[PDB]
Structure 1
């Protein structure tokens, strides 16, 4: 099951450290995808450390990517943060 991560924790993950984000309350860790993703690292890192839901959706995404997102997630932003 998900362990949750407070935005305090999420805030620590936005560098070589690791790159987290929040898409739809769900927390992400994408520190390698930084390499592969057509956005580049910069454009994930830019958002990274939480809430990238708006950028993710304004750009928006395919099913493929939403499915990928499951194996890029680590859990949720905690309910004591939402």
Structure 2
């Protein structure tokens, strides 16, 4: 797997590179950023951030499962990820 620093998602909080920490796994939905039927902001607004709950809360359908996976590159340092815990 590919472990990215929390610094990434951050700098990657723009359209160019839209990342979102999902279940200890960043989702490069850059291409599917404006394609998102829900909203392009809901993603960006909290892209680099953590939209895990904001992603699971909405309850993504299988259709997403395929995409999400397809739009997977790797996870972010889970060391700084558990900064809350």
Normalising by structure 1, report the TM-score: 0.86
What is the DSSP-based 3-state SS (H/G/I as helix, E as strand, rest coil) of the residue aligned with 2:49?
coil
Give the drift of 1:16: 2.7
Aligned residues: 81
What is the DSSP-based 3-state SS (H/G/I as helix, E as strand, rest coil) of the residue aligned with 2:3?
coil
RMSD: 1.4
Provide the rounded CA distance (Å) in 2 between the counterparts of 1:72 and 1:59: 18
Normalising by structure 2, report the TM-score: 0.83
Decide whether the 8 Å contact of 1:27 with 1:50 is kept in 2: no
Provide the rounded CA distance (Å) in 2 between the counterparts of 1:52 and 1:23: 7
Richer in strand (by share)? 1
